[PDB]
Amino acid sequence: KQYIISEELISEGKWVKLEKTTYMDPTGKTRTWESVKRTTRKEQTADGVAVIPVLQRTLHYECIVLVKQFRPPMGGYCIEFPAGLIDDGETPEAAALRELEEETGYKGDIAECSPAVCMDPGLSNCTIHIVTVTINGDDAENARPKPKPGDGEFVEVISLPKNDLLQRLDALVAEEHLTVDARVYSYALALKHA
Amino acid sequence: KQYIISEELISEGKWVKLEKTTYMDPTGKTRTWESVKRTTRKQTADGVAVIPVLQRTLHYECIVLVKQFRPPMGGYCIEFPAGLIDDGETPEAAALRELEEETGYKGDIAECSPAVCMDPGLSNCTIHIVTVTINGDDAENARPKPKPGDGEFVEVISLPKNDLLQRLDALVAEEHLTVDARVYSYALALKHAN
Ligand SMILES: [Cl-]
Ligand SMILES: [Mg+2]
Ligand SMILES: [Mg+2]
Ligand SMILES: [Mg+2]
Ligand SMILES: [Mg+2]
Ligand nearest to the CA of B86: 5
B189 in A contact zone (CB under 8 Å): yes
B55 in A contact zone (CB under 8 Å): no
Binding residues of B for Mg(2+): 82, 98, 102, 152
Beta carbons of B33 and A115 less than 8 Å apart:
no
What is the domain-level CATH number for residue B145? 3.90.79.10
State CA A148 to chain mean position distance: 18
Resolution (Å) of this entry? 1.7
- Whole domain around residue A82: which residue ranges? 1-194
Residue of B nearest to A174 (CA): B114
Experimental method: X-ray
Q: Domain count of chain B? A: 1
C-alpha gyration radius of chain B:
19
